[PDB]
Each structure stands twice: as C-alpha cells, then as structure tokens.
Amino acid sequence: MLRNLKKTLVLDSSVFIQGIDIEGYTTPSVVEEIKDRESKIFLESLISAGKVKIAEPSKESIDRIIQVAKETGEVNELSKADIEVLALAYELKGEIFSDDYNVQNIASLLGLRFRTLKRGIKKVIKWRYVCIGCGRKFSTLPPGGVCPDCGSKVKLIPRKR
Ligand SMILES: [Zn+2]
C-alpha cells in the first residue's frame, strides 16, 4: 500500500544541509558529525518516515575510491564522509545526491550518475582557450595568442560543460 519510492539512491551530508527532501540511503558515519538542528531534525524525520535507511559501505568500496583517487593524486586529501557516501553508492551502482566541488569530481571520474544543486559559480570563472603543447588553459587570448608557459600556439575550445 502507498509505497512510492525512487530507484536506488544514496544521499550525502550536503543533502541534509540544503533542505533537499529526497529518498534513498544515508551513512551512519556522516550522521555522527551532523551537529546542526536543521540537518538533524530533517535527517531523523525522513529516517523515521522511511524515506531514507541506514547503510555504511564495504571496505572494498572505500578502497575503490582510493584506487582512482591515488591515480588522480589527492588520495586521502578528501574527507571521510565524502569517501564513505560515494563508495557505498558505487557498491550499489545506483545513484548519489550531493553538491561539493570534490564530491562532484569523484563521481565524475568514477562514472556514477548523480544529482547536484542550483548553484553556478561561487569563485570560479568561465574560460575559452587552450595551448597546444603544455595544454595550458586560458580565459583570454595571450599576446600573439601563444603560451606564456611553453611558447606553443593557443587555440579556441568548446563550452566548459
Ligand atoms: Zn603551453
């Protein structure tokens, strides 16, 4: 009776920060660090409403992030909650919800489909030019349109996204 639910989905700490009513699983790891009132009452209520169920990842799932992470460089430079949520969803091959700069990247290189929020920029810029040699990014054409880092020519590129 009346058991509407989405497909598999895992929710991050940040989802309980913004006020995003959604369903799925939550990490008993991250909730230990959730000290606010909004992000408590909301999380606990959705839990008790059976919108979200408790699940922490397998070790191999954590180690999965470590593999691709040590290949991209920042291996443990990411927070534990971050790794924990992401890992779990990769074991389920389901879905994720978050809106962090690293969280977005990791799910990207891991190939896992996720949702994120209506922000757009909070410090970053657009850009539109690329060196051909050292592959340096530019937002403008340098003098001669040549690379102040390798001397090679610079050319235009497609959209950021
Ligand atoms: Zn260059």
From Swiss-Prot:
Keywords: Endonuclease, Hydrolase, Manganese, Metal-binding, Nuclease, Ribosome biogenesis, RNA-binding, rRNA-binding, Toxin-antitoxin system, Zinc. SMART domains: PINc. GO terms for cellular component: preribosome, small subunit precursor. GO terms for biological process: maturation of SSU-rRNA. The keyword Mitochondrion does not apply. InterPro entries: NOB1, PIN-like_dom_sf, PIN_dom, Ribonuclease_PIN, VapC_family. Residues 7-105 form the PINc domain. One of its GO terms (molecular function) is RNA endonuclease activity. Mn(2+) binds at D12. Residues 120-125 are annotated as: Flexible linker. Its EC number is 3.1.-.-. It is an enzyme of class 3 (hydrolase). It holds the Pfam family PIN_6. Residues 126-161 are annotated as: Zinc ribbon. It comes from the Archaea. Its cofactor is Mn(2+); Zn(2+). Manganese; magnesium does not support nuclease activity. Binds 1 zinc ion per subunit. Toxic component of a type II toxin-antitoxin (TA) system (Potential). Processes pre-16S-rRNA at its 3' end (the D-site) to yield the mature 3' end. Has 2 structurally independent domains; the N-terminal PINc domain which binds Mn(2+), rRNA substrate and probably has endoribonuclease activity, and the C-terminal zinc ribbon domain which also binds rRNA substrate. This is Endoribonuclease Nob1. It comes from Pyrococcus horikoshii (strain ATCC 700860 / DSM 12428 / JCM 9974 / NBRC 100139 / OT-3).
